[PDB]
Write a protein that binds this ligand. Structure first.
Ligand SMILES: CCCCCCCCCCCCCCCC(=O)O
Ligand SMILES: CCCCCCCCCCCCCCCC(=O)O
Ligand SMILES: CCCCCCCCCCCCCCCC(=O)O
Lengths: 108, 110
């Protein structure tokens, strides 16, 4: 169901963010607003890659905003859908800083 | 060098063919000016792809919506259908700045 699916994707993002070495080489320093479209409503999360924290909310001036459907997120996570294909199919909506967006695409 | 010249001309002819194909009054979602910087061994080839007016010109635009910096061989492969824009990004082959919405809308239309 929706809640288990959302919880799963968020825990996976939290694991990846926690795996970053704060002092190691880093390219993606920004705050990402994540809007997850679900059949029930939108789940709103803040992925702060500068401070390395993931919190629920809507950040005031995110560097990048990402809006994507839940099922597509799960597909990208399990590698049944590539980011380039998701892009080609118009499955991701972005606003904000193109540089930070491109650098994110490189590390997913 | 002739090899570089032919590759650049081919890239630009292809972009011009594509932009000339667009119906000015049909559905359009990529309305912006893209600065295209193509790195070669002979220096940077600088081109303005204006998708608002649907013109391609050599030059450096003062304030483009998106700047795209890409190597010659990668840009050749992208224009020749052998490298997808998507895989280019994943591989870190494109440098972007500016408007993410317009960058993504462009990745959708090719
Ligand atoms: C909110 C945008 C969509 C979801 C963001 C994906 C987050 C998954 C984990 C990202 C790991 C970032 C790697 C950082 C290393 C670096 O800065 O170079
Ligand atoms: C212009 C480039 C767009 C880049 C944005 C890519 C989409 C970000 C959201 C994809 C979800 C990835 C989360 C999966 C986390 C994981 O399983 O490791
Ligand atoms: C960013 C990678 C390379 C960029 C080079 C631009 C490629 C030529 C652009 C042609 C796209 C024309 C389609 C636009 C129609 C529309 O606005 O919906």
């Amino acid at each position: 169901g929706i809640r288990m699916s959302v919880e799963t994707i968020i825990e996976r993002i939290k694991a990846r963010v926690g795996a970053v070495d704060p002092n190691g080489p880093r390219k993606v320093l920004g705050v990402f607003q994540l809007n997850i479209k679900t059949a029930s409503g939108v789940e709103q999360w803040i992925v702060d890659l500068k401070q390395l924290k993931v919190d629920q909310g809507v950040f005031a001036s995110p560097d990048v905003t990402v809006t994507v459907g839940l099922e597509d997120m799960l597909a990208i996570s399990g590698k049944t859908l590539t980011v380039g294909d998701a892009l080609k199919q118009g499955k991701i909506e972005l606003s904000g800083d193109a540089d930070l967006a491109a650098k994110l695409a490189e590390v997913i």
